[PDB]
Design a protein around this ligand. Structure first.
Ligand SMILES: Nc1ncnc2c1ncn2[C@@H]1O[C@H](COP(=O)(O)OP(=O)(O)OP(=O)(O)O)[C@@H](O)[C@H]1O
Ligand SMILES: Nc1ncnc2c1ncn2[C@@H]1O[C@H](COP(=O)(O)O)[C@@H](O)[C@H]1O
Ligand SMILES: [Mg+2]
Lengths: 415, 554
């Protein structure tokens, strides 16, 4: 059976009472990932270990345990075993894990492994922290003022995929029901008409806002901003705002600011105030270009979170070095967010920025905020110095070209 | 007084149906002569769907006549079966009527013919009295085919060259030939089927007659090995169009060749699929009585749409359609059945597995592994009902059990591995040329036969080659694109990208290079475009049920 060796001297991360007990000797599972995962994963392990050794003197150490998924999983488990049932089980059990890229499918017929892991492990939160790194090439004038954390709902909205083709009977049947049974007067063209359904629910909404407010508490963020299209879609996007504001009142004891919806929520640990605010989506996308500093932690629906994260990454020049995570009721999975770039795999050439920064997400999620900072210091140190991998080197001037492993060393040398 | 009427009404149905079956089969020569390959394809579909029209007709008749009992009829029907030449199929025909009348319920021995309950020569001998040079001339001349031959003497020169290599010039003078009276028709081939009677024993003798483009008929090869005939009459190949006024006599005759095939399988090959099914159940019941065994989940990778089980030592799998598919498979139950219907009508080219729809199939509770009972009860609850000591699976398929290509590849070294991947590519090529797109080319969806040939069995994602848009993967616009997780280009349903096939087909370090030397075309969109262009131009790719090397031309 199993071909994962559980490390002898490590110990399991435990969830009890809704709080994460992280032992000083934690076992962290890691998937190498397809293609360039082979170059970027070693680099991460070296840096994440280095940050822990320096920050905690050696009083802490991570027991790495390789689990499997994808092309490599084929090489150990058998021919067409791309996702072993134990991988899911080990991730559920050890609560926290990290992976390189898995092959995403072009073409509609085939099975995606990334989506398999998500829906399988029931990871309904897409977490995307965006900030600038001094020296990164950027299209904007002041990218340094951008330091946000996007809490994106991942189980509802138009992204659910509840849709019917035009002229499909099912569609005509659906349209029929709305038009005569529900009396819908606002479909301009009922013939040759596709239909999609947009569901937003209280239970689904509050998981996300709850998670985000906690994160603000845990990491000393200033505010949580609910982003929505309340002014047009009043019962989907508008309810998302209303429920989010209701949660901060009922569960976190938010006091009103000047009668306006805005709430002052008090951090239980520090005493410092966390502002709960809301802004319209189309406006927000302007507001992030013009005035990024105002914003901190952002909670929003599926479609909106996707749009905002893709725009924010562009502004800060970190499309190729964007960290990511997917969180559920019982575990968390930090991922590299780029593709597998099979073309380059094994040349130790690509930028490990993304996975390394998901490792910093991981470290902060373990409460080991100190060690996370040393990576941050390492990344901004090595970027400023212009000792970078090809993807940046070609764009910067007076830069030193380094291999993947080498850039990792540069990150370590600036800690 | 109806007792006899109903019984007579049913037998009238059988006489009717089999006569039509013979007529539809009689047109196999004229379809072949005129190269009407779309009618050849069409006749296969009609013969398959012929039996079911008459069963339906008889049932409606019986309903209009009838709008303990069944045993009166059963015995009446039994009484006119002696001195009736095709009693076996008549019993099966009887069964089909009861099964529709009672929606496949309460099927046991005395209510219907679940057990058997119970002239004109079909070949002629040929002896080399005046040498094989002339003997073969006489055989070829005795053929009713109304087209010309280019160099009969070439083909006759070939067949002796084979016969001399196969066995000694002393055995060949003492050996003789017993060829069957009819020609077995399939696709663009007319088959001569005979027996080779040697002092050392009796051997298969098979000559496929092919047709030059708007021209003569040539014998493409000569086959005399026990194992080669298996392939020709294979489960994965389409059924033969052969005129058989008495099939039971032909099944007995064919049995001397094809010694490994069961009665049912032998009936299948000639095109009596519904009777084959009756004999399939008896072969099942006989095996079941002969052993103490539990139904288990079949080896290999679990199904995301099909739940499949088997018996440890049994040569067939049972596939049932789950109540719920995996989240990523956006399919209706009706569509899978439609895919299965498609393959059953279609020409399989020895690359697709033959299935048998069974309604309300009965299993004993004690025969099921606890692991499977929970799996069946958990993933297929709607499909099953409880009957005390037994359960009823509403609907399942039965097909030949092979060994899954994903399993086989792990047990195979250098030389045999080279044979495996060759068989895969050729399988994919042959299927694509036969207007079929294999949805999940993944190895877990192909089986390996006793002969080492590769056959496809997942029909989750099947579709016609004419239905898909084959695309090249766009070159990157900017460097950024090389490292993105998602395409920047729009993708439609029906869009296929042969380039991406590499990731699932060339993961392993051994198999990749072999694909790269043997089947580079499978990963280029231009190859699938050329193929689909020919299917759109009406061209039908010839399939040889034999090695390409065996051909006379090489
Ligand atoms: N003819 C056969 N011989 C041996 N094993 C078989 C056969 N047919 C099916 N199986 C086994 O049953 C499994 C599931 O059946 P099948 O692959 O036909 O459909 P599926 O699994 O629903 O499709 P998918 O590959 O998309 O999940 C196979 O992976 C294999 O292990
Ligand atoms: N559920 C079943 N169990 C056993 N035999 C069956 C079942 N369904 C059909 N058959 C047999 O299969 C043959 C063809 O049946 P049908 O496909 O209904 O025409 C008949 O001889 C039937 O007796
Ligand atoms: Mg399968």
């Amino acid at each position: 059976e199993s071909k994962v060796v559980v490390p002898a001297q490590g110990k399991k991360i435990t969830l009890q009472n809704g709080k994460l007990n992280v032992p000083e000797n934690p076992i962290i599972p890691y998937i190498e990932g397809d293609g360039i995962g082979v170059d970027v994963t070693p680099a991460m392990l070296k840096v994440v270990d280095a940050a822990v050794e320096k920050a905690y003197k050696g009083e802490r150490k991570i027991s790495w345990m390789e689990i499997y998924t994808g092309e490599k999983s084929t090489q150990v488990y058998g021919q067409d075993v791309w996702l072993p049932a134990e991988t899911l089980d080990l991730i559920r059990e050890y609560r926290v894990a990290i992976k390189g890229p898995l092959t995403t499918p072009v073409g509609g017929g085939i099975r995606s492994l990334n989506v398999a892991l998500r829906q399988e492990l029931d990871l309904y939160i897409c977490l995307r922290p965006v900030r600038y790194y001094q020296g990164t090439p950027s299209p904007v004038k002041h990218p340094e003022l951008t330091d946000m954390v996007i809490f994106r709902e991942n189980s509802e909205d138009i992204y659910a995929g509840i849709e019917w083709k035009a002229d499909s009977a099912d569609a005509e049947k659906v349209i029929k029901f709305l038009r005569e049974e529900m009396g819908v007067k606002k479909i301009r063209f009922p013939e040759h008409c596709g239909i999609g359904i947009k569901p937003c629910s209280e239970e689904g909404t509050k998981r996300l806002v709850r998670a985000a407010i906690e994160y603000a508490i845990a990491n000393d963020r200033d505010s949580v901003t609910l982003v929505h299209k309340g002014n047009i879609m009043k019962f989907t996007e508008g309810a998302f705002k209303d429920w989010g504001y209701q949660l901060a009142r009922e569960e976190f004891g938010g006091e009103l600011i000047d009668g306006g919806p805005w709430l002052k929520v008090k951090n239980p640990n520090t005493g410092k105030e966390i502002v709960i605010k809301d802004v319209i989506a189309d406006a927000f996308l302007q507001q992030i270009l013009l005035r990024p500093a105002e914003y901190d932690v952002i909670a929003c629906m599926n479609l909106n979170g996707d749009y905002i994260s893709d725009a924010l990454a562009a502004q800060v020049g970190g499309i190729g070095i964007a960290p990511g995570a997917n969180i559920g009721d019982e575990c968390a999975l930090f991922e590299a967010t780029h593709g597998t770039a099979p073309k380059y795999a094994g040349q130790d050439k690509v930028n490990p920025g993304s996975i390394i920064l998901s490792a910093e997400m991981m470290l902060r999620h373990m409460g080991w905020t100190e060690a996370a900072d040393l990576i941050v210091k390492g990344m901004e140190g090595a970027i400023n110095a212009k000792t970078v991998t090809y993807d940046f080197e070609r764009l910067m001037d007076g830069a030193k070209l380094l291999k993947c492993s080498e850039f990792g060393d540069a990150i370590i040398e600036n800690m | 007084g109806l007792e006899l009427l109903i019984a007579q009404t049913i037998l009238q149905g059988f006489d009717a149906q089999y006569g039509r079956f013979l007529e539809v089969t009689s047109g196999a020569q004229q379809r072949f002569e005129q190269a009407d390959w779309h009618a050849v394809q069409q006749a296969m579909k009609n013969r398959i769907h012929l039996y079911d029209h008459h069963v339906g007709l008889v049932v409606e008749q019986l309903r209009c006549i009838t709008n303990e009992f069944l045993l009166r009829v059963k015995e009446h029907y039994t009484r006119l079966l002696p001195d009736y030449p095709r009693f076996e199929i008549a019993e099966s025909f009887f069964n089909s009527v009861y099964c529709r009348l009672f929606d496949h319920r309460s099927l046991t021995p005395e209510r219907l013919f679940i057990f058997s309950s119970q002239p004109r020569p079909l070949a002629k001998d040929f002896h080399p009295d005046h040498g094989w040079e002339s003997l073969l001339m006489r055989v070829i001349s005795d053929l009713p085919l109304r087209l010309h031959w280019q160099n009969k003497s070439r083909d006759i020169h070939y067949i002796i060259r084979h016969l001399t290599e196969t066995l000694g010039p002393e055995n060949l003078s003492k050996s003789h030939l017993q060829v069957a009276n009819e020609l077995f028709y399939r696709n663009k081939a007319a088959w001569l089927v005979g027996k080779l009677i040697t002092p050392s024993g009796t051997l298969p003798f098979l000559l496929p007659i092919h047709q030059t483009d708007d021209g003569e008929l040539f014998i493409d090869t000569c086959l005399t090995t026990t194992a080669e005939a298996s392939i020709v009459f294979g489960f994965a190949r389409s059924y033969f169009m052969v005129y058989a006024p008495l099939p039971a006599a032909l099944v007995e005759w064919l049995r001397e060749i094809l010694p490994g095939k069961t009665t049912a399988e032998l009936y299948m090959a000639i095109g009596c699929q519904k009777h084959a099914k009756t004999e399939s159940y008896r072969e099942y019941l006989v095996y079941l009585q002969g052993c103490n065994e539990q139904f288990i989940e079949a080896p290999g990778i679990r199904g995301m749409v099909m739940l499949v089980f088997t018996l440890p030592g049994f040569d067939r799998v049972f596939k049932v359609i789950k109540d719920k598919f995996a989240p990523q498979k956006e399919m209706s139950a009706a569509h899978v059945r439609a895919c299965y219907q498609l393959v059953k009508e279609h020409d399989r080219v020895g690359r697709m597995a033959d299935t048998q729809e069974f309604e309300n199939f009965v299993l004993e509770k004690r025969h099921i592994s606890p692991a499977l009972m929970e799996l069946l009860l958990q993933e297929a609850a709607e499909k099953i009902t409880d009957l005390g000591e037994q359960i009823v699976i509403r609907h399942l398929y039965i097909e030949r059990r092979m060994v899954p290509l994903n399993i086989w590849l792990e047990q195979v070294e250098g030389q045999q591995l080279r044979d495996a991947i060759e068989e895969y590519g050729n399988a994919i090529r042959q299927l694509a040329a036969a207007n079929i797109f294999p949805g999940d080319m993944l190895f877990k969806n192909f089986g390996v036969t006793r002969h080492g040939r590769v056959v496809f069995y997942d029909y989750d994602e099947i579709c016609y080659m004419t239905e898909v848009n084959f695309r090249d993967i766009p070159p990157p616009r900017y460097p950024e694109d090389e490292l993105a997780s998602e395409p920047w280009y729009s993708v439609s349903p029906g869009d296929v990208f042969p380039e991406e096939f590499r990731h699932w087909l060339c993961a392993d370090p051994r198999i990749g290079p072999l694909f790269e030397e043997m089947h580079a075309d499978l990963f280029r969109a231009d190859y699938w475009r050329a193929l689909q262009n020919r299917i759109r131009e009406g061209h039908v790719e010839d399939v040889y049920a034999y090695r390409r090397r065996q051909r006379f031309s090489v």
